[PDB]
Structures are given as C-alpha cells and as structure tokens.
Design a protein around this ligand. Sequence first.
Ligand SMILES: CC(C)=CCSP(=O)(O)OP(=O)(O)O
Ligand SMILES: [Mg+2]
Ligand SMILES: [Mg+2]
Lengths: 296, 7
Amino acid sequence: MIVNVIQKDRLKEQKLQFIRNHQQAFDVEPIYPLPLFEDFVTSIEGDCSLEASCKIESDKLIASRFLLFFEDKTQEWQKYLHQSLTFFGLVENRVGVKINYSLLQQFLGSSFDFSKVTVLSAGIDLRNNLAESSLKMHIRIKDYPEKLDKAFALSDGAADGNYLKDFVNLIGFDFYFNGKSEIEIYAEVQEDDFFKPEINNLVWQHFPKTALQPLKASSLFFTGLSKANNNPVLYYHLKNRQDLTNYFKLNDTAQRVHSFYQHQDILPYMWVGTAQKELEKTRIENIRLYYYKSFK
Amino acid sequence: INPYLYP
Ligand SMILES: CC(C)=CCSP(=O)(O)OP(=O)(O)O
Ligand SMILES: [Mg+2]
Ligand SMILES: [Mg+2]
C-alpha cells in the first residue's frame, strides 16, 4: 500500500515536470489558464500520456498546447469523459466563458457505445487572446459506422467524400472560449498498408511527390479534415523524432523546438503536422510539432 | 502503438 502512495505522488510530479519543461522553454510566463490544466492532470490517478506541442507560424511560436490521453487499461471511457467535461466546466467558471458543446452532444447523441472507444484525450490550446484559446478532445472509434456517419454529417462538407469513411477512426473536437466550436475528421493510413495498390489508387496519387517522402520514416499517416483548417493538414508519425530534420526543411523557430527536444527525457516518436503546400517549398514556414511522455 | 492509435 505504501508503494502505491509513493508512486501516486511521483507520477503527479513527473507529469507537472513534463508540462513545466515545455512551458518554461518557450514562454517565460504561463498562459492563463494553464494552472487549471495542471490541476486536471494532477487529479487523474491512472496511467496516462501527455502531449506537449508547438505550432510555428513563420517566427511566431505558439507553445501553450497540451493534451492528456486516458490510458488506464480499465477502459472506463464514460468516467474519463465525465472527468474531462468536469474540467471544461471549471474552465468555464474561472475564465467566465461559455463553451459551445453542440458538436460533441450531437456526436455522442443519445445512444453512445463506449465499448467502441479506443482513445480519449482532453486538453488545451491557449492564447493571450482569450477568444482564440480552445479546449480540445479526441475520441477514437473502432467498428462504429453509425458514429462515423454522424461525424461526417457534422463536418459540414469538410468531409471531402464518403469514400473516406474507410480511413477514419479519430474524431477531433475543438471548443473555443468565444463559443465557436469545430469538428475534425482524420483519415489514416497505417504503415502495413503504405505499399498496397489500393492505397496508391485512393490516397497517394492525389498527393504531390514531396508529401510521400516522409512516409519512409513514418509508422502512421493522417490527413486532418476540418472547415477550421485553411488547408488539409498532413500528419506524419515519425518513429524517431531525430529524423525530423532529415525529412522536413525546418525554419529557425522550428529548429529551436527540435533542438530543445533532442535530449529531453521523452518518448522516441513524435508527430509532425504541416499543410501539403509547405512541403512543396524550399523551407517550411508553418508546422506543428508534437512530443510525448507516458506515465505508468 | 501510439497515443492516437491504441496498439
Ligand atoms: C498530432 C495528431 C496526429 C493529431 C492531433 S493534431 P490537432 O488537430 O488536435 O491540433 P491543432 O490544434 O489543429 O494543431
Ligand atoms: Mg488549435
Ligand atoms: Mg486540428
């Protein structure tokens, strides 16, 4: 029992540490309301992962981006959903904002089968301009075509085609502090399928050649579809974060992020997000970089 | 495998 007490406290601090490392590297002052997210990660007692992230816009570094993945192998999805929403409510109270939940409500509907959930995340993407700040949630669904149809319908035409239902498992929800909300659909291709002719037919031949190059170093590929996106966002899951510079032509700002992370005590893999037209360039100007730590 | 894909 005493072992559990030590480990509990240890995990709490290790999580805050990962968060502080990231914030302290890129922002002298924490963006409000980061301390509320810090309290939320602390309140979660099971096994989790954290994502710390930077969005680079030329020389603009946006670094107050964090996500928690519920990974306690009990599969208590409804419990985790209720904890996430409780946290979101607290943010509403302290900040004095009202979140628009309608897209999540319609997606959940009345009959949600939680046994079909394989990932749940909750988090923040915080700005100095409160209105531009957002709360985030992802839900990954397996063998739930009824819910896939719903999310596609909710996309409001950002869903490029109904043939993409074959590729979609992850659903993203953004909740802006100004009462605007967005849904995102992520079309995926796994590594085992990269070289299949059906995949070349339905996916690869629609992308320029430069978009295909980072697949060599990747275990997974998403295309993020949302009407909040200026362009389709291509996501590459690099097996080793060290390969970033080999496959992506980084600007100074993104190199700074890359440099900081090369020798942090974090997971070997990373995610990279960039618009298709950035890869056509001689130097990427707009890029999203995602780093991970697990806490068992 | 990773936090966005269970295995
Ligand atoms: C890293 C991956 C594959 C998915 C999460 S990216 P997102 O759409 O949640 O993040 P953005 O805030 O849109 O950059
Ligand atoms: Mg965002
Ligand atoms: Mg997005």
